[PDB]
């Protein structure tokens, strides 16, 4: 009702790309139109119109980043991102981006992820604690796009290595999953694994029976969407204890789950596996982390005291170091007596 606005929460899923504010996305556009470098109407247009299936939704994504992708920029929706979730009590935050290069801006893979790191040291409107009035503890996670090459994920996998000074603790592997094939990121993966940061895949958003198996067999710390598992995947998953990132406005909006009353998220709730509720894009989904919660409690009938308990039991998937976990912990059990 309004107790899951106040509800201390862990993101797992959220998207920096995914995750603007309509009114800077359309202020960049504005700026980038009476620059006369795109159409104001026309990219207007789409941010209205495109439907967000999950073959549309991969056009917006082209169409964002042809607005986002500069130093100043980067840095300021990371500063927005992390006001926006921290203002709906968020208290720690896995923030995923893939890194990009433009050669015509000078823009580098780590030139890109330094201009992140600007953008927290930027937060003012609460406490940030990025590496070890509202508090929130924020770390990283690079993103591999299915575009991309094997050494191409292998320059990501070394730079989250290099920045785990200011944060970075894992790496995604998302984008388009009609695109790729798992055997070009598999190595660079395997790679991540063996210099102990933390994997999270985005898992089954179409069907793929030997793609999903083969993540599952990989066992990543976590997966995301798990929309077309078959019972083989579903038993290994379970088996395997990996925990699921659920993103329910995501998967109806792009028809991925034809409705929340028949979304696995309930039957892994029943099954005790572990679930972490993720907005994935909360700006492309016009949702937020509070919503999300408040869709899971009407659907699965929570009181406020199980929908505590599954918030609290976020925080040992989280990637981040025992110490965080441990701070993590003193914060649930400040507000549990207040979660009947
Ligand atoms: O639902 C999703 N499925 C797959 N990839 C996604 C999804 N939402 C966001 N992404 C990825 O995240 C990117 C947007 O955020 P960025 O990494 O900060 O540029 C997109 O270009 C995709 O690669
Ligand atoms: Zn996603």
Known sequence: MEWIQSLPKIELHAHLNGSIRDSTLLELARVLGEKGVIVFADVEHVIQKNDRSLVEVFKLFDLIHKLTTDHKTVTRITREVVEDFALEN??????????????????????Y????????????????DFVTRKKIYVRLLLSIDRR????????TVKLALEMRDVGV????????????????????????KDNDLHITLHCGEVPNPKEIQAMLDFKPHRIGHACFFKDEDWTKLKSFRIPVEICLTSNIVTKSISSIDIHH???????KHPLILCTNDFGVFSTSLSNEYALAVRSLGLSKSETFALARAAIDATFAEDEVKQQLRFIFDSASPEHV
């Open 265 to 271: 998220f309930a039957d892994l709730y029943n099954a």
């Open 90 to 111: 968020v208290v720690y935050l896995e923030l995923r981006t893939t890194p990009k290069r433009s050669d015509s801006i000078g823009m580098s893979k780590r030139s």
């Open 169 to 192: 603790v894992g790496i995604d592997l998302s984008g388009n999953p009609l695109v790729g094939e798992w055997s070009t990121f598999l190595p660079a993966l395997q790679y991540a």
């Open 113 to 128: 992820m330094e201009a992140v790191i600007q953008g927290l040291r930027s937060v003012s409107e609460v406490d940030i």
């Open 148 to 155: 991309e090459t094997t050494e191409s994920a292998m320059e």
